[PDB]
Design an enzyme around this catalytic site. Structure first.
Site, PDB file in Angstrom:
ATOM      1  N   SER E 170       0.745  -0.943  -0.044  1.00 17.87           N
ATOM      2  CA  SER E 170       0.082   0.033   0.086  1.00 17.87           C
ATOM      3  C   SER E 170       0.761   0.978   0.186  1.00 17.87           C
ATOM      4  O   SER E 170       1.915   1.187   0.467  1.00 17.87           O
ATOM      5  N   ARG E 171       1.160   2.068  -1.145  1.00 15.42           N
ATOM      6  CA  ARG E 171       1.825   2.568  -1.293  1.00 15.42           C
ATOM      7  C   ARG E 171       2.052   4.325  -0.442  1.00 15.42           C
ATOM      8  O   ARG E 171       2.949   4.182  -0.160  1.00 15.42           O
ATOM      9  N   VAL E 172       0.984   4.409  -0.396  1.00 14.73           N
ATOM     10  CA  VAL E 172       0.900   5.570   1.000  1.00 14.73           C
ATOM     11  C   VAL E 172       0.036   5.515   2.318  1.00 14.73           C
ATOM     12  O   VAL E 172      -0.360   5.859   3.294  1.00 14.73           O
TER      13      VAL E 172
END
Lengths: 120, 120, 48, 101, 303, 265, 116, 303, 116
Positions: E170-172
């Protein structure tokens, strides 16, 4: 079947032979119609045509059709689109095996191989 | 008790009188006997458990009355009947061989075996 | 030469009437080469 | 393989050296006059004895050695562009001499 | 909940399921079933995203699940082919990238100026034959931020659901998490990507350190597991993760892990739901809360 | 291309799978005879050991180690190698006699000085008295074994049918036999050559047993290894199968697209 | 067997079988190593490596290439010469004494040559 | 025999071979040679079938061998593409399935109303490299019931004719095969099945059971070799298989299997061609015949 | 070599070669085990496993995502680190030690952390 379901209220069961040959027949009709073939040859209208066939089979208030289909997977590739589209529609799969039948078990059905979503 | 044991056999691994040909001449071991270690010379062996007697032709080894009345006899290969005419012919050739050729000692041992065989 | 070498020869002699079996015959025939090594150095793999 | 012939491992040992022999430094070409000795050395198995790691060092040194001593030989290899029995022997002797570096 | 390309019967069961959980009243369902025509399906996600935007542009928080965009791909493919536009790769048209990208980027956390609107997008991709390098999936992956790959082997092999975390990113994501669920869960992702390594090379010599990691890892994996339609409160999740992180599942033999979870939760509420209320409101763990939890977890472990 | 290079590689993997299956079964076959032999041998050993125990025989040195000519029989070679190396820290200057090539190579690297006697042709057969006797005879004559009043032999004890623990045991020199106290609780003549004979006899009897224990572990290891091989190969079949299926589909589609493009024009 | 006679056919069947066996065994030799392949197999393999290089035979128009003057042997003679190989009368001859030479007579000569 | 796209020289050879065995006087050869034009090639199997209809209709029996429909496919491709019909899979016409199915169903064993005039058929399909995945093979395999799958390795391995019976099937099965031959070849199926499984062994210590299978299996395989263009009668099918079943051949050395076969047959002809003829005429193996035969096989084995 | 110094090029060459060996032995590693690799090769494999792990260097912008503070490592330092690794100087420490850390000095220090 629909006369039975709708107009005799009955729950009925409709067998189909190869649904591979259903797909095969359809792919050809598209090609004859001159439409650009979709991946792995199959008709561009592959999804919709199967969709009509397998959504006219259901439990209505009146009755219910139930359909047993025979899936003749080409090249035993479950990655192939013709099986894949079929597997999307299917609720359960009954996996008869000859190994099991050779164990003398009639039903021919291989119990571990069979999988259902109706078993819940 | 008795253990008559070999690498590839476990003949008599109860036994009452055993008659053995040993570096101390010929020895008989009967019930309790003094606890000894004696190398068995190449041999004609009789083992008696009760009056019943079984006869072995034995490649020599070691004999050891253990202080627990376990007569450990260990030898390389034995039945007397399996060992014992054609062999006498071969051994005659081997007697000739000592003339020509450690090999002198080997052939000498073969002559000793011929004497033991003659005893059978 | 050893005492057990004497016994060895006797065991081989014992596989000589004719009532013999293959496992017996195999127990008295074997192929090997003792490669006497040395300090890297190594006298030949002279037959055992 | 569960068994390796000594003969195959002779090949293997020679072969490995040959691979190192083939290598050449990028952007540096090399005169044919000075490729004839090196290939002679390799093919006549002189380098087979010489350890795998230091083949490159050996190559550099060998050329220097021939430049120093057998520069007459090199001139001939260039000049006649073929190798006579005598030249092959001269070269053979030179290589043998430099096996002991 | 956008249902695209799905059995009309199945969708009706889903709707009934939602109405069983009385959830229909807080939710909208857009439906474009398998029976429903392919051009309708093409316009189906776009229309749904419009519906979402009205909430978003009230500043209200919302979420949209586009299930399954893989069926949208097949639809756009059909449409394109029937418009006789040149067949793209894998017969999926050349403008397919644009189709997904225009859809996906219409959801977002807006700014304070816009009244902090949000439309949380969860697009659900059906990997055909489980091909994780397939053209449509890779194209989607590049557009999306984070992926939640689920592993079939694990699903069969005793987790239903089985959320593979090796291929889930989950990138951020971590910046939106509650501070408590950052603290308790600190480095557990790393730890279970050490477990991933450990079981990679387990199949061989095992150091006692490795065994300790393996024992923690396997047992932690058991703890992750959950069964369909049984959710856990945010407050409830904090102690459970605290326990595992603090290695109290070395203290629980593998068989009794399930017992530990239910019993621990019952224990915590009975022992002091005051703590859980604190974690509920404070949403962070003070030194006192950390100690109180350490003490409490040790207390449950004993019983 | 991709398809054909996949296909040949998958075929290679298939052939490997078939071989590893075949080998594993044959390994099982070989193992049954091996174990049978080991019992009979061990029984003989126990009778002699009964003397040595009751005698309480006690104790440069020799190190003897055994690992067959042949390989691909697990980590028999290297677990034994590690345990030899461990006991080569117990006397750096000990003379290592390597019975069979595989242990020979590994130890030869670790100390090449210590390799003094070595034996080839071991691995081919299942242990036999004939071999043991000659190796012993040569140990006595060539290595003058008695000079080193410590003799120790290494082998692989086949601990469980799925395990092997490399093991060592001490062969009792004639000196040990002489001065062991409960040697005196057995009796034979002083004019007997029994210390010098009994040493020799158990040099060989112990050695044959050590070889038998090792051989069983070897054949067992080969079964285990070849079984694990079949599993590893199967996984590779599955990985290339998915690749094959994907590749096959992709080729059909890409070629078709070209045909269509041509028709379209 | 009708067209080129029974002998030719039988000889060629034996060659084909020998080679087919060799190829089949090639995989086994590759991993397992030739050792536990039968005594019979070893004779067949030994013949196959020899037959493989008995096929080899220089060509005059490959004095350009190989630099070895060509050799062309009568068909009837070739059948005989290959027959000899199968009979194993020349299974004492080194592999390289079959390599890149003509007929059986030449193979024998090259055996003598290599011997020297 | 329907010679499709075959070299005129090849068909001349066929004609010559047929003339050699004096078979032209029941043979019909519909010939579309390699040179012959693609319309002729397209209609060639259809035409041939029509010839067959006359016989079939007349209630007589016949066998039509379509050789090879793989070349029929290519011709249809040539026609279709030149007629600018839309191309399809593997550049074969879209309705190639439809073509093949039309041809392949005209073969028939009629009702007893129509006097059951058989028109047995045996289409031949050429595999590109054993590529059963290929579109024209896949289609045909489905359309037909039964397959014979010849195998190149076997051909090289001197099994001429080479039929890989692992990949051959007959769905028609027990409807055919004389009762006698069924009895004495049920065993044969099971034995051969084992030989296939036990083919893997070829290496050290080989169990006696495995070895029994290997010996018996090799001898059976050797028995089933046939000199091409020499067929053998049913009265000679029955003895040979009976021997194999009784393991009477197992003892006979491999080199002598061939010799055994002809000798056994001649021996049977001399000793008791009454038995062979009786077997032939009854078509069902009577216990008395199996008895006499058992004696005969033993007697021959002794010599 | 000229552009970035011969030593750098030599170091890099050796790294590339080593890693290529490791890639080559990926087949053998899977089909068999690791113990069925040659001892000489097994050292190479162990070194290469270290090299791979050494290559993971946290990034400062990814410091959040990894959860590890970033590492910026000097070019001169980098060369030193690889030089040592090729000579196996510090090789005798966990592959976890090499994993996700900066330069050789950091690796050395993390060995102490792991050792505890």
């Amino acid at each position: 079947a629909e006369y039975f379901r709708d107009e005799e209220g009955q729950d009925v069961l409709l067998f189909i032979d190869n649904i591979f040959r259903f797909t095969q027949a359809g792919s050809e009709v598209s090609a004859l119609l001159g439409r650009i073939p979709s991946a792995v040859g199959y008709q561009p209208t592959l999804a919709t045509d199967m969709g009509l066939l397998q959504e006219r089979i259901t439990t209505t208030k009146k009755g219910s059709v139930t359909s047993v289909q025979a899936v003749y997977v080409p090249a035993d590739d479950l990655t192939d689109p013709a099986p894949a589209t079929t597997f999307a529609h299917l609720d359960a799969t009954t996996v008869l095996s000859r190994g099991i039948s050779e164990l003398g078990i009639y039903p021919a059905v291989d119990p571990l191989d069979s999988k259902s979503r109706l078993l819940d | 008790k008795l253990q008559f044991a070999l690498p590839h056999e476990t003949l008599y691994s109860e036994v009452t009188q055993v008659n053995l040909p040993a570096k101390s001449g010929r020895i008989g071991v009967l019930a309790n006997h003094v606890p000894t270690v004696e190398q068995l010379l190449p041999g004609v062996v009789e083992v008696m458990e009760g009056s019943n007697s079984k006869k072995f032709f034995i490649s020599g080894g070691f004999a050891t009355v253990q202080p627990d009345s376990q007569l450990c006899v260990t030898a390389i290969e034995a039945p007397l009947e399996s060992f014992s005419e054609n062999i006498k012919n071969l051994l005659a050739e081997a007697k000739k061989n000592v003339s020509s050729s450690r090999e002198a000692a080997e052939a000498a041992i073969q002559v000793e075996v011929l004497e033991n065989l003659q005893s059978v | 030469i050893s005492y057990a070498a004497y016994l060895n020869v006797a065991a081989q002699a014992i596989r000589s009437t004719e009532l013999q079996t293959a496992s017996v015959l195999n127990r008295s025939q074997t192929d090997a080469f003792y490669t006497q090594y040395k300090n890297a150095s190594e006298p030949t793999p002279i037959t055992k | 393989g569960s068994d390796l012939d000594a003969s195959t491992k002779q090949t293997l040992v020679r072969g490995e050296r040959l691979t190192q022999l083939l290598k050449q430094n990028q952007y540096s070409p090399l005169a044919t006059e000075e490729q004839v000795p090196l290939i002679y050395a390799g093919v006549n198995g002189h380098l087979d004895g010489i350890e795998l790691s230091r083949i490159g060092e050996f190559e550099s040194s060998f050329l220097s050695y021939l430049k120093s001593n057998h520069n007459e030989l090199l001139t001939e290899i260039r000049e006649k562009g073929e190798l006579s029995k005598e030249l092959l022997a001269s070269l053979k002797s030179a290589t043998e001499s430099f096996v002991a570096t | 909940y956008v249902a695209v390309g799905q059995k009309r019967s199945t969708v009706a069961q889903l709707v009934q399921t939602l109405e069983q959980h009385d959830a229909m009243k807080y939710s909208i369902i857009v439906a474009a079933t398998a029976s429903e025509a392919a051009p309708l399906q093409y316009l189906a996600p776009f229309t749904a995203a419009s519906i979402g935007e009205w909430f978003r542009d009230n500043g209200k928080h919302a979420l949209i699940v586009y299930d399954d965009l893989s069926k949208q791909a097949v639809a756009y493919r059909q449409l394109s082919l029937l418009l006789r536009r040149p067949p793209g790769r894998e017969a999926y048209p050349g403008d397919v990238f644009y189709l997904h990208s225009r859809l996906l980027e219409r959801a977002a956390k807006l700014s304070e100026k816009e009244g902090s609107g949000s439309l949380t997008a969860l697009p659900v991709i059906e990997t055909q034959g489980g091909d994780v390098s397939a053209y449509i999936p890779t194209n989607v992956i590049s557009i999306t931020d984070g992926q939640i790959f689920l592993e079939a082997e694990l699903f069969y092999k005793g987790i239903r659901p089985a959320i593979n975390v090796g291929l889930s990113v989950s990138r951020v994501g971590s910046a939106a998490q509650v501070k408590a669920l950052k603290q308790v869960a600190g480095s557990l992702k790393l730890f279970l990507a050490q477990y991933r390594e450990v079981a990679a090379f387990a199949q061989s010599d095992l150091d006692a350190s490795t065994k300790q990691t393996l024992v923690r890892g396997e047992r932690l994996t058991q703890l992750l597991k959950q069964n369909q339609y049984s959710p856990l409160a945010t407050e409830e999740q904090v102690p459970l993760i605290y326990a595992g992180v603090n290695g109290h599942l070395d203290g629980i033999e593998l068989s009794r892990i399930g017992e530990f979870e239910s019993s621990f939760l019952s224990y915590l509420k009975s022992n002091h739901n005051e703590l859980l209320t604190e974690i509920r409101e404070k949403g962070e763990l003070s030194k006192e809360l950390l100690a109180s939890l350490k003490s409490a977890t040790e207390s449950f472990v004993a019983t | 291309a991709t398809l054909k290079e996949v296909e040949m590689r998958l075929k290679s993997i298939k052939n490997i799978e078939k071989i590893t299956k075949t080998m594993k079964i044959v390994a099982s076959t070989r193992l049954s005879k091996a174990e049978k032999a080991k019992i009979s041998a061990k029984k003989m050993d126990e009778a002699e050991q009964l003397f040595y125990k009751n005698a309480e025989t006690k104790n440069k040195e020799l190190i003897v180690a055994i690992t067959s000519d042949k390989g691909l029989c697990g980590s028999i070679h290297s677990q034994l190698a590690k345990a030899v190396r461990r006991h080569l820290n117990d006397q750096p200057n000990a003379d290592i006699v390597t019975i069979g090539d595989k242990i020979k190579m590994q130890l030869l690297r670790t100390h090449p000085n210590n390799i003094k006697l070595s034996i080839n042709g071991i691995g081919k057969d299942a242990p036999t008295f004939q071999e043991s006797a000659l190796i012993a005879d040569k140990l006595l004559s060539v290595m003058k074994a008695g000079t080193y009043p410590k003799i120790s032999i290494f082998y692989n004890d086949p601990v469980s049918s799925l395990s092997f623990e490399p093991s060592e045991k001490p062969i009792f020199n004639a000196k040990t036999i002489e001065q062991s106290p409960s040697f005196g609780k057995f009796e034979i003549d002083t004019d007997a050559n029994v210390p010098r004979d009994l040493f020799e006899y158990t040099l060989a009897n112990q050695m044959l047993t050590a070889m038998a224990q090792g051989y069983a572990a070897e054949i067992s290891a080969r079964r285990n290894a070849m079984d694990n091989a079949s599993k590893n190969a199967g996984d590779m079949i599955n990985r290339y199968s998915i690749l094959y299926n994907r590749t096959r589909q992709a080729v059909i589609t890409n070629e078709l697209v070209d045909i269509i493009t041509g028709a379209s024009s | 067997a009708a067209v080129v006679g029974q002998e030719h056919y039988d000889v060629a069947s034996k060659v084909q079988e020998t080679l087919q066996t060799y190829k089949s065994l090639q995989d086994i030799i590759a991993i397992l190593g030739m050792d536990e392949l039968s005594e019979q197999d070893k004779l067949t393999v030994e013949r196959a490596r020899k037959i493989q290089r008995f096929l080899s035979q220089p060509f005059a128009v490959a004095e350009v290439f190989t630099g070895i003057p060509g050799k062309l042997v009568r068909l009837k003679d070739t059948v005989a010469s290959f027959k000899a190989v199968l009979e194993g009368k020349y299974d004492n001859i080194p592999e390289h004494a079959f390599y890149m030479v003509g007929g059986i007579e030449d193979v024998v000569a090259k055996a003598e040559k290599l011997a020297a």
